[PDB]
Design an enzyme around this catalytic site. Structure first.
Site, mmCIF file in Angstrom:
data_model
loop_
_atom_site.group_PDB
_atom_site.id
_atom_site.type_symbol
_atom_site.label_atom_id
_atom_site.label_comp_id
_atom_site.label_asym_id
_atom_site.label_seq_id
_atom_site.Cartn_x
_atom_site.Cartn_y
_atom_site.Cartn_z
ATOM 1 N N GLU A 43 0.821 -1.217 0.000
ATOM 2 C CA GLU A 43 0.000 0.000 0.000
ATOM 3 C C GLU A 43 0.850 1.260 0.000
ATOM 4 O OE1 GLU A 43 -3.016 0.531 -0.567
ATOM 5 O OE2 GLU A 43 -3.936 -1.495 -0.421
ATOM 6 N N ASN A 56 -7.049 10.801 -5.370
ATOM 7 C CA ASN A 56 -7.798 10.184 -6.449
ATOM 8 C C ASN A 56 -8.617 11.198 -7.220
ATOM 9 O OD1 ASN A 56 -7.066 7.448 -5.757
ATOM 10 N ND2 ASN A 56 -8.185 7.861 -3.888
ATOM 11 N N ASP A 72 -11.753 10.903 -7.997
ATOM 12 C CA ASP A 72 -13.075 10.909 -7.496
ATOM 13 C C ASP A 72 -13.339 11.807 -6.324
ATOM 14 O OD1 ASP A 72 -11.985 9.507 -5.360
ATOM 15 O OD2 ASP A 72 -13.146 7.684 -5.667
ATOM 16 N N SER A 83 -11.640 11.707 -3.465
ATOM 17 C CA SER A 83 -11.182 11.071 -2.239
ATOM 18 C C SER A 83 -9.667 10.974 -2.238
ATOM 19 C CB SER A 83 -11.760 9.686 -2.067
ATOM 20 O OG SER A 83 -11.170 8.733 -2.930
ATOM 21 N N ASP A 92 -6.380 8.641 -0.259
ATOM 22 C CA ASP A 92 -5.943 7.523 0.571
ATOM 23 C C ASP A 92 -4.790 7.986 1.427
ATOM 24 O OD1 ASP A 92 -7.655 5.791 -0.961
ATOM 25 O OD2 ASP A 92 -6.092 5.781 -2.496
ATOM 26 N N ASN A 120 -9.045 5.215 2.923
ATOM 27 C CA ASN A 120 -9.714 6.185 2.050
ATOM 28 C C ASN A 120 -10.680 7.073 2.776
ATOM 29 O OD1 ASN A 120 -12.275 6.504 -0.067
ATOM 30 N ND2 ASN A 120 -10.291 6.637 -1.070
#
EC number: 3.2.1.17
Length: 129
Positions: free
Chosen positions: A35, A46, A48, A50, A52, A59
């Site tokens: 990760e 991201n 969208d 969001s 992480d 997220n």
């Protein structure tokens, strides 16, 4: 901070992850490796809306609040900045919630693609635990 493998394993063991909901310690270490490459400051922004955050790339749509993400649920009840600490406690507490909210480790794409079906004990082999 960028952890070492064995140092992270020991920290995760102290925080109760070994065999948490049936997932051995090496699963958690493997997930963190793929990760974030063991980097507590890792962020992935991201398209969208969001983001992480942190060593386990948690997220911001479902799990933590960053104030910028549409549809926020904040199920871990924490600001996402808490997941960027050098201490792993907030990330571990939220990871435990992720699994307790009816997900297994399949919630982490890197676990499913890079750790599932592998010899995850390799990630703790040789370590002082």
């Amino acid at each position: 901070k960028v952890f070492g493998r064995c140092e992270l394993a020991a920290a995760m063991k102290r925080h109760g992850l070994d065999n948490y909901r049936g997932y051995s310690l090496g699963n958690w270490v493997c997930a963190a490796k793929f990760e974030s490459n063991f980097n507590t400051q890792a962020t992935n922004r991201n398209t969208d809306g969001s983001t992480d955050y942190g060593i386990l790339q948690i997220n911001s749509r479902w799990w933590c609040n960053d104030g910028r993400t549409p549809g926020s649920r904040n199920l871990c009840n924490i600001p996402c900045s808490a997941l960027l600490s050098s201490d792993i406690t907030a990330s571990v507490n939220c990871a435990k919630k992720i699994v307790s909210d009816g997900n297994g480790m399949n919630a982490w794409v890197a676990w499913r693609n890079r750790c599932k079906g592998t010899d995850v004990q390799a990630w703790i082999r040789g370590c002082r635990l």
